[PDB]
DNA sequence: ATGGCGCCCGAACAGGGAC
DNA sequence: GTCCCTGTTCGGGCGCCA
C-alpha cells in the first residue's frame, strides 16, 4: 500500500534519444521495484526486477538504476518500438502498486489543426436529431483546446469529444467534438462557431457556419 | 514458452456479477515459485493490482475489494480464476491475468502475461447504429483538399468497424474512439480527399456492427 | 495439623548410612523441659515413639530462655546431614518488589508450623530418630522420631517448597486473577478488586490452606497502606526498607569492616551510587579477623558521603507494562560503576553498581560492557526484558573501539548522554608506521637462574641503551624493553619488538592495571603523538633483530 | 499411550553422576512458551512432574523458529551426553554416506516428534530433568521429567534407528537416488534435482512420515518481501572452497617485507616447501621501518615461487574419525567472519569464511553464532560429527546472548578464548 | 535450622606459549 | 620436560529472607 508516483507522466523524443524515466515511491522499497512495458497494441511485456536486473531477452539498452525510494528507467538511444507505456512496480508491502506508468511518444515537429465544421444533415434533423461536429484532424501535440460557442460564447451543454493516438504515420493527433444539441435547440439559434486554439501562432483557429434548416 | 489466456462474459448487467478464467499452460499452479496474478487497466487509467494467487494456498487481495472479490484456481487443469460480484459502472475494464513467480531470494516479479479480457458494465441492450453523412454542405468545397465526415450514433455493442470506399480509401484516415453517450456509443470519423476526387467520383464511409448484424453503406 | 499431601522420598547418599552420635546428657532441668517438649509434640502428632532396634540417633541440646510460648529444645542434626542425598534446591533467587506490579488490593498471608506441618518420608523416618537423657532415675531413657519436617535438616527447605506449591496449584488455575507469590512460608497476594471481592479470595484461600493442613494466623497483614514482606516496605505506590540502621562506633574491627561493606551494598537497592570499595579496600589485605584498621581515615571522606546518602530518605515505585525499562550508568571511582533503572525519569525503580577488572588489563569501554551485559542478565530476571541503556560515552567511541576489537562484542539498544566522566579510549595505536620518526629495535631477555636480566635496544641510526634489572622474568623484560624505547621517544615512533605477549597487552587498549610497568606504558602512550607498533619474529634475524640479539646478549647477558 | 516396545538398557559412563547444571534466566518470551509446551506434554504423559528428591538438572530454553507449527523447545543435554554409555547403536546405525556432500541441495527436516512414540529406561529419567522458572521469581522452580525419549539426547537416535530404518525403507526403496542422513533431531535429505522438483521430494517424504508413525515434522512458512524461504535450501555443490589468502604489489617498503616474511615463517607449518631465509637476508640491517624500500630483484624469484609451492590445496587431508574435530572463529575485518576446522593442529582439513550478512541485521554475537551454526551444518553434512568451537568471545558475553540467535535443533560444544596476529594474520589456516 | 542470593578478597587450577 | 601468566571456580566473611 505504498503510493508510487511516476513523476513526469508522458514526454517526448526522437530516434537515437536518450530516456529517463522518474519513479517515486513512499518509503525505502530496498529496490522492491519492476519496470512493465505496455506496448500500443495492448500487450505488457516484463522488462526488469530489482529496479536493475535485466529480463532475460531484453536488449541492453534498457538499464537498470535506482535507490531507497526514488528509482530511475533509462534507455541509451531510443528505437521506434521502445515508444509506448512504462509502468513501474513495487513489492514490499504486499499490496502491489503500480504508479501510472511513463509515456514515451515521438517528437515531431509541430503543426496547426487542419479544422473543418460539419453542419447537422437533414437525414438526421428529421428525427429530432441535430449533431453538429468539429473535426481537428493532424496536429502536434495533443495540447489542443476547443470551443464550442453559439452566439454568445457559451459552450453550449452537449459537449463530447474524443482525441486519437499519436499515428505513427505522421507523429502527430486528432480529436473530434460532436455538439449535442436537440432540433427545438437548432432552429432557436442562427450561426453555430468552432473555435480550435492552438501553439500555431497565437491565433484562434475559428470556422463556422449559418443555416437553421431542418 | 509457457503462455496464459483468459476469458470472460464480456458484459454483465450493473449489480450483477461475473466470473474471469485464466487458462495457462507451461507452469504449474503446485510449484513452489509459480502463482497467477489478477491486474485490472481501467478505461484510460493505469495498471490496478485486484489479488494475486499463490501456490501454497495463500490468496490475497487488495484491502479494497477483498470485500466483493474472491479468486480460485484447478490446479488440476492449469485454471485460476477471478470472481466479481455486484459489479458497478466503474469496473467497466479490461482484466489480465499474469504468471508471477518468486524467482529467487530478492526477485519476484510478473514474467508473463497475455492480453486481458474486456468486461462491460452497462444496463444497455443490442443497437444497430445511426449513421449520418457528414456532407460539407453550407461552406462549398474550397480548398484542394476536402474533409468527408460520417457520425456513427447509438450503438451498444462496443464492437463497430468503419471504412471508406469499400476498402479504396486508406491514405488519409481518422477514427475516433466512441464515448458513453446516454449508455450508448457515438462514435465519428472522417477522411480527406484530393478536391477533384469527391466531387466527382462517390465517396463512401460503410458501418458495420457485428452485434446488430447491420451493415449499411452512406454514400456522399 | 498433619498435611495429607503426598510424601516425597528421599534416601541416603549411596556410600553413608544412618547417623549415629552419642546422646550426651543434659542438664537435669534441661531434660524435663525436652520432656515437656517431646510430649506435647507427640501428644499432637509431630513426632512418635520409637521401637528399640533403632540405632541411629542425633543429639539434642535444649534451651527454653526465649519469650514466653516461645522455647528450644531442638535437635543439631548435622550428623544426618552429612548423609542425607542433596537435592535440586528448585530456586532461582528470592523476589524484588521492583517486578512486583501495582494491584487494588493487596495481603500478605502466613502459615505457621511450616516445616511442622508437612510429613517426612516415613521411610526415611526412623533416620532423624533420637533420645532425650534421661534423670538419673530411670535407667533406660525415651525414644523418638521426627513424623513431620525437622528444622536443620538439608531436606526440610525444598520439601516444603515443592509442597506449598502443589498446595496452592489448583487454587491458582481456578482464580488466574489473584497474584500470589509464594516464598518459603510467606504468602503474598494482589488483585484489582474492591477490597471486599478481595477478603472473599483471601478468605476462600485460607480455607483451602488450612484445609490442606497449612493454618494462617492472624499475622495475616490487613492494613492495605503497609505490608512487611521479604523485608521490604510495602505501600500504595512505593517500597522501601527502613531498617537501614548501622554501627558508626563499631566499625573500627576488621570483621565490622565486613559488615557496613554488606549493609552498604544491600543499601544500593534505591539508594543511589555508592563506591563501597572506600571501606572494601580496608578489608582487603587484611587476615587477622579480629584487630583493627586505621585506613578508616580515609573513609571519614569517603564514607562520609556514603552515610549522608544513607540518610537520604529514598524509596522505588511498582513495575508497569504499558511503559518500558531504561538503565543509564554513572562513573565514578576507578573501576565504580553505577545504573540506575527506571521507567518514568525521577521514578526511580531500582539501583545498583559494577566493581570488577574481568582481568589484569581492561579498559574503560570492557568495563561498561561488562556492567550493560551485567544489568541486562539481572532485568532479564527481574521483569524478564532486556531494557534499553543510556550509556554515558559518544556513539564514534563505541564504534571505533569496536570495530578495531578483533574480538566478538556487542551491546544492546542503546543510546548517548553525557555528563559523568565520559568514558572514551585514551590512546590510539597508528595503522600505518609514521615516516618521519624514529624506529627503535626493542629487545628484552633473561635467564630463568639468575633471577636477572636485561631490556635494551637499538635505533635505526645506529643509537643504542642497555639496563639490567632484576626480580623479573623473560616476558616480564620484554614487556619493559618497550617501556624504555618509549621513556627515549620523541613525539613520534616506529616501535618494533618480538615479545607478541608485550603486543597483546598493548593492542587491548589498557586504560589502567594493577600491573605498575604496563600502567606505566599506557599512561606514557597517553601522552605520546603519534605510536606504532608491528611484530617480528625473534629466530629468524629480520632486520636490526640480529642486531639487538648480540647486544643484549654476547652469547649471553651479564 | 506409548509403544510396547520394551525398554533398551540405557546406563552412563562409570564414575559419572549425571548432569547437575544449574538453569539460566529466561525472558518472559521465552518462559510462556516453554510452559504451554511442556505442561501439554504433561497430559499427553511423554512428561510427568517430580520434586527436590532428584538432584539432577540439565536446561532448557525456547527458540522462536520461523515455521507453522509453534515454538521449539530446547533441553541442553551436552553434560549428560558425554556422561551416556557408548551406544553401538548408533556406531552402526548411523553409518555417513559420503555422497551426502555431493549434490545440487540439500533440506533439513526436524523430526523431533518421532522420538514421543518410543518410551525411555524406566530406570534413568531421573537423568533427563530440567526446571521451568518465572519472571521475578513468583513462584519456585517447575521440574519436568522424561518418560519417552528426550529430544536431542545421544541415546534417542541410537535406539530409534530400527523404527526410522523401516519407516523411511518405503521411501528411499520407491526413489533410491535419493541420500537421507539422520543427525540427533534432524533429517538430512539431499538430490541432485532441480530445485522445485527437490521441494516437491521433500514434501513426499513429508507426507510419508505422517502415515507412518505419525512422525510429524516442523512446517515451514513461506511468504513475499525478502524471501528467506528460498534459502532455507542447503546447496553445497558450490560450498566455499578455501583458497583465498594471498599477497602482492610492487614497491613494498621495510614495514611491508619484514610483514611478508613473519607471515610464511609460520604458513612454514601448513606449507613445507617455504623459503624464509631469502626474505630475511634481503632486509638484514637496523634500515628504517618505514621509508626504506629495499626493491630487490633476487627475492622476487623466490617470493612468487612460495606461491607456486602453496599453489593448491595441501597434500595432508586425512580424516581420522578417531579424533574429535575443532574449529576456529576469527572476526577478520567488518562483518566478513573466517573459520577452519582441523583434527590436528596447522593440518586443517577444511577452511572457510562466513561473509557479509544480505540483512539490515547488525550485531557482532549474531554473526559469530550464525557462523558457528552454518560451520556446524557443513562439518555435519560432511564427517557426520560436530567440531568443537574456540570461540572469539568471553563466556560472559557469549552467554547472554547465543541463545536469542541461535535456532538449530542440535547444540556444539564450545569454549571460550584468544587469537594472535598469526592467524588474524588474514591467514586462516590453523 | 537449614537453604537461597548477591558482594568482595585469596587460593588452586588448569592451559595456551617456549624455552 | 617445567615455568610463565592468566582467566576463571570455589572457600570464606558478610548483609538479607523464611
Same mark, same amino acid.
Given at each position: ?157 452537449? @459537449? ?18 460532436? /455538439? ?35 | ?40 487497466? +481501467? ?27 474472491? @479468486? ?55 443497437? +444497430? ?47 475516433? +474512439? ?43 | ?73 531442638? @535437635? ?99 482464580? +488466574? ?119 578508616? &581515615? ?224 599506557? !599512561? ?21 633483530? !640480529? ?12 | ?76 543435554? %551436552? ?38 512414540? @518410543? ?91 505422517? %502415515? ?11 511468504? !513475499? ?75 622476487? /624469484? &623466490? ?92 563466556? !560472559? ?6 541463545? &536469542? ?26
Amino acid at each position: 500500500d505504498i503510493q508510487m508516483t511516476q513523476t513526469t507522466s508522458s514526454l517526448s523524443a526522437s530516434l537515437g534519444d536518450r530516456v529517463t524515466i522518474s519513479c517515486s515511491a513512499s518509503q525505502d522499497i530496498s529496490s522492491y521495484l519492476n519496470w512493465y512495458q505496455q506496448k500500443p497494441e495492448g500487450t505488457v511485456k516484463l522488462l526488469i526486477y530489482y529496479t536493475s536486473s535485466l529480463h532475460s531477452g531484453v536488449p541492453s539498452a534498457f538499464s537498470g538504476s535506482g535507490s531507497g525510494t526514488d528509482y530511475s528507467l533509462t534507455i541509451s538511444n531510443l528505437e521506434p518500438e521502445d515508444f509506448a507505456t512504462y509502468y513501474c512496480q513495487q513489492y514490499s508491502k504486499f499490496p502491489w502498486t503500480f504508479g501510472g506508468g511513463t509515456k514515451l511518444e515521438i517528437k515531431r515537429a509541430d503543426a496547426a489543426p487542419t479544422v473543418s465544421i460539419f453542419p447537422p444533415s437533414s437525414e438526421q434533423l428529421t428525427s429530432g436529431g441535430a449533431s453538429v461536429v468539429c473535426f481537428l484532424n493532424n496536429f502536434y501535440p495533443k495540447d489542443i483546446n476547443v470551443a464550442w460557442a453559439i452566439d454568445g460564447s457559451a459552450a453550449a451543454n452537449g @459537449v463530447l469529444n474524443s482525441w486519437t493516438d499519436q499515428d505513427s504515420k505522421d507523429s502527430t493527433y486528432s480529436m473530434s467534438s460532436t /455538439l449535442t444539441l436537440t432540433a427545438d435547440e437548432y432552429e432557436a439559434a442562427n450561426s453555430y462557431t468552432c473555435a480550435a486554439t492552438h501553439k500555431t501562432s497565437t491565433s484562434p483557429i475559428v470556422k463556422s457556419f449559418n443555416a437553421n434548416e431542418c | 514458452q509457457i503462455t496464459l489466456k483468459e476469458s470472460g462474459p464480456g458484459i454483465v448487467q450493473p449489480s450483477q456479477p461475473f466470473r474471469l478464467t485464466c487458462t495457462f499452460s507451461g507452469f504449474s499452479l503446485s510449484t513452489s515459485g509459480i502463482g497467477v496474478t489478477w491486474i485490472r487497466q +481501467p478505461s484510460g487509467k493505469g495498471l490496478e493490482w485486484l489479488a494475486t494467487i499463490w501456490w501454497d494456498d495463500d490468496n490475497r487481495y487488495n484491502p479494497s475489494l477483498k470485500s466483493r472479490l474472491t @479468486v480460485s484456481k484447478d490446479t488440476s487443469n492449469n485454471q485460476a480464476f477471478l470472481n466479481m460480484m455486484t459489479v458497478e459502472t466503474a469496473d467497466t475494464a479490461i482484466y489480465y491475468c499474469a504468471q508471477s513467480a518468486i524467482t529467487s531470494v530478492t526477485d519476484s516479479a510478473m514474467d508473463h502475461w497475455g492480453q486481458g479480457t474486456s468486461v462491460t458494465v452497462s444496463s444497455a441492450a443490442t443497437t +444497430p447504429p445511426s449513421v449520418y453523412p457528414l456532407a460539407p454542405g453550407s461552406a462549398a468545397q474550397t480548398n484542394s483538399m476536402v474533409t468527408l465526415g460520417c457520425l456513427v450514433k447509438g450503438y451498444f455493442p462496443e464492437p463497430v468497424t468503419v471504412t471508406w470506399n469499400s476498402g479504396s480509401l486508406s491514405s488519409g484516415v481518422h477514427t475516433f +474512439p466512441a464515448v458513453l453517450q446516454s449508455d450508448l456509443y457515438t462514435l465519428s470519423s472522417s477522411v480527406t480527399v484530393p478536391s477533384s476526387t469527391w466531387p466527382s467520383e462517390t465517396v463512401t464511409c460503410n458501418v458495420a456492427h457485428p452485434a446488430s448484424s447491420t451493415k449499411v453503406d452512406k454514400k456522399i | 495439623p498433619i498435611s495429607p499431601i503426598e510424601t516425597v522420598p528421599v534416601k541416603l547418599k549411596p556410600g553413608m548410612d544412618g547417623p549415629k552420635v552419642k546422646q550426651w546428657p543434659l542438664t537435669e532441668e534441661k531434660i524435663k523441659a525436652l520432656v515437656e517438649i517431646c510430649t506435647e509434640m507427640e501428644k499432637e502428632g509431630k513426632i512418635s515413639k520409637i521401637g528399640p532396634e533403632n540405632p541411629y540417633n542425633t543429639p539434642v541440646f535444649a534451651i527454653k530462655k526465649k519469650d514466653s510460648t516461645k522455647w528450644r529444645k531442638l @535437635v543439631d542434626f548435622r550428623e544426618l546431614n552429612k548423609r542425607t542425598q542433596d537435592f535440586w534446591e528448585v530456586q532461582l533467587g528470592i523476589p524484588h518488589p521492583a517486578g512486583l506490579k501495582k494491584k487494588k488490593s493487596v495481603t500478605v498471608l502466613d502459615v505457621g508450623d511450616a516445616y511442622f506441618s508437612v510429613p517426612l518420608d516415613e521411610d526415611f523416618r526412623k533416620y532423624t530418630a533420637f533420645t532425650i537423657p534421661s534423670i538419673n532415675n530411670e535407667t533406660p531413657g525415651i525414644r523418638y522420631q521426627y513424623n513431620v519436617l525437622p528444622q536443620g535438616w538439608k531436606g526440610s527447605p525444598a520439601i516444603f517448597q515443592s509442597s506449598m506449591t502443589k498446595i496452592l496449584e489448583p487454587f491458582k488455575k481456578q482464580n +488466574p486473577d489473584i497474584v500470589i507469590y509464594q516464598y518459603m512460608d510467606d504468602l503474598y497476594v494482589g488483585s484489582d478488586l474492591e477490597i471486599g471481592q478481595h477478603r472473599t479470595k483471601i478468605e476462600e484461600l485460607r480455607q483451602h490452606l488450612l484445609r490442606w493442613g497449612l493454618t494462617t494466623p492472624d499475622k495475616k497483614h490487613q492494613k492495605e497502606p503497609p505490608f512487611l514482606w521479604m523485608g521490604y516496605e510495602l505501600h500504595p505506590d512505593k517500597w522501601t526498607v527502613q531498617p537501614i540502621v548501622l554501627p558508626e562506633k563499631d566499625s573500627w574491627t576488621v570483621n565490622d569492616i565486613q559488615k557496613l561493606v554488606g549493609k552498604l551494598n544491600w543499601a544500593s537497592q534505591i539508594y543511589p551510587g555508592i563506591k563501597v570499595r572506600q571501606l572494601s579496600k580496608l578489608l582487603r589485605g587484611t587476615k587477622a579477623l579480629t584487630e583493627v584498621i586505621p585506613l578508616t &581515615e580515609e573513609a571519614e571522606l569517603e564514607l562520609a558521603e556514603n552515610r549522608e546518602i544513607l540518610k537520604e530518605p529514598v524509596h522505588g515505585v511498582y513495575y508497569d507494562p504499558s511503559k518500558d525499562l531504561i538503565a543509564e550508568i554513572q562513573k565514578q571511582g576507578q573501576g565504580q560503576w553505577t545504573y540506575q533503572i527506571y521507567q518514568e525519569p525521577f521514578k526511580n525503580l531500582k539501583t545498583g553498581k559494577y566493581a570488577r577488572m574481568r582481568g589484569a588489563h581492561t579498559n574503560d569501554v570492557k568495563q561498561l560492557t561488562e556492567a550493560v551485559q551485567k544489568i541486562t542478565t539481572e532485568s532479564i530476571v527481574i521483569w524478564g526484558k532486556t531494557p534499553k541503556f543510556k550509556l554515558p560515552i559518544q556513539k564514534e567511541t563505541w564504534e571505533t573501539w569496536w570495530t578495531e576489537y578483533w574480538q566478538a562484542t556487542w551491546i544492546p539498544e542503546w543510546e548517548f548522554v553525557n555528563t559523568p566522566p565520559l568514558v572514551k579510549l585514551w590512546y590510539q595505536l597508528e595503522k600505518e608506521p609514521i615516516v618521519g620518526a624514529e624506529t627503535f629495535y626493542v629487545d628484552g631477555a633473561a635467564n630463568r637462574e639468575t633471577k636477572l636480566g636485561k631490556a635494551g635496544y637499538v635505533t635505526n641510526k645506529g643509537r643504542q641503551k642497555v639496563v639490567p634489572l632484576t626480580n623479573t622474568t623473560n616476558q616480564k623484560t620484554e614487556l619493559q624493553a618497550i617501556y624504555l624505547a618509549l621513556q627515549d621517544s620523541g613525539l613520534e615512533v616506529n616501535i618494533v619488538t618480538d615479545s607478541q605477549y608485550a603486543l597483546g597487552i598493548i593492542q587491548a587498549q589498557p586504560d589502567k592495571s594493577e600491573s605498575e610497568l604496563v600502567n606505566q606504558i599506557i !599512561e606514557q602512550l597517553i601522552k605520546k603523538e603519534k605510536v606504532y607498533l608491528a611484530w617480528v619474529p625473534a629466530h629468524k634475524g629480520i632486520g636490526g633483530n !640480529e642486531q639487538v640479539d648480540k647486544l643484549v646478549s654476547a652469547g649471553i647477558r651479564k | 499411550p506409548i509403544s510396547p516396545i520394551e525398554t533398551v538398557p540405557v546406563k552412563l559412563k562409570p564414575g559419572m553422576d549425571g548432569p547437575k547444571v544449574k538453569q539460566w534466566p529466561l525472558t518472559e518470551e521465552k518462559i510462556k512458551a516453554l510452559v504451554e509446551i511442556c505442561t501439554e506434554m504433561e497430559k499427553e504423559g511423554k512428561i510427568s512432574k517430580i520434586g527436590p528428591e532428584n538432584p539432577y538438572n540439565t536446561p532448557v530454553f525456547a527458540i522462536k523458529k520461523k515455521d507453522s507449527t509453534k515454538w521449539r523447545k530446547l533441553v541442553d543435554f %551436552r553434560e549428560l551426553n558425554k556422561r551416556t554409555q557408548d551406544f553401538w547403536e548408533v556406531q552402526l546405525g548411523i553409518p555417513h554416506p559420503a555422497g551426502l556432500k555431493k549434490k545440487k541441495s540439500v533440506t533439513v527436516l526436524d523430526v523431533g516428534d518421532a522420538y514421543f512414540s @518410543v518410551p525411555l529406561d524406566e530406570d534413568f529419567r531421573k537423568y533427563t530433568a530440567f526446571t521451568i522458572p518465572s519472571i521475578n521469581n513468583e513462584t519456585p522452580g517447575i521440574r519436568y521429567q522424561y518418560n519417552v525419549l528426550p529430544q536431542g539426547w545421544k541415546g534417542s537416535p541410537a535406539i530409534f534407528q530400527s523404527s526410522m530404518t523401516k519407516i523411511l525403507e518405503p521411501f528411499k526403496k520407491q526413489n533410491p537416488d535419493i541420500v537421507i542422513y539422520q543427525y540427533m533431531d534432524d533429517l538430512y535429505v539431499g538430490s541432485d534435482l532441480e530445485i522445485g522438483q527437490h521441494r516437491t521430494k521433500i514434501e513426499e517424504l513429508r507426507q510419508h512420515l505422517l %502415515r507412518w508413525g505419525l512422525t510429524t515434522p516442523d512446517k515451514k512458512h513461506q511468504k !513475499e518481501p525478502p524471501f528467506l524461504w528460498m534459502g532455507y535450501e542447503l546447496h553445497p555443490d558450490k560450498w566455499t572452497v578455501q583458497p583465498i589468502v594471498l599477497p602482492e604489489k610492487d614497491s613494498w617498503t621495510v614495514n611491508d617485507i619484514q610483514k611478508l616474511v613473519g607471515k610464511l615463517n609460520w604458513a612454514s607449518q601448513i606449507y613445507p616447501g617455504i623459503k624464509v631465509r631469502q626474505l630475511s637476508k634481503l632486509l638484514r640491517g637496523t634500515k628504517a621501518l618505514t621509508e626504506v624500500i629495499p626493491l630487490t630483484e633476487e627475492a622476487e /624469484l &623466490e617470493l612468487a615461487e612460495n606461491r607456486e609451492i602453496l599453489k593448491e590445496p595441501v597434500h595432508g587431508v586425512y580424516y581420522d574419525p578417531s579424533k574429535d574435530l575443532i574449529a576456529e572463529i576469527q572476526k577478520q575485518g567488518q562483518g566478513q567472519w573466517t573459520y577452519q576446522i582441523y583434527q590436528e593442529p596447522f593440518k586443517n582439513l577444511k577452511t572457510g569464511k562466513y561473509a557479509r550478512m544480505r540483512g539490515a541485521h547488525t550485531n557482532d554475537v549474531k554473526q559469530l553464532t550464525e557462523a558457528v551454526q552454518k560451520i556446524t551444518t557443513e562439518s555435519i553434512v560432511i564427517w557426520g560429527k560436530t567440531p568443537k568451537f574456540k570461540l572469539p568471545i568471553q563466556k !560472559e558475553t557469549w552467554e547472554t546472548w547465543w541463545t &536469542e540467535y541461535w535456532q538449530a535443533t542440535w547444540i556444539p560444544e564450545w569454549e571460550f578464548v584468544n587469537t594472535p596476529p598469526l592467524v588474524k594474520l588474514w591467514y586462516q589456516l590453523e
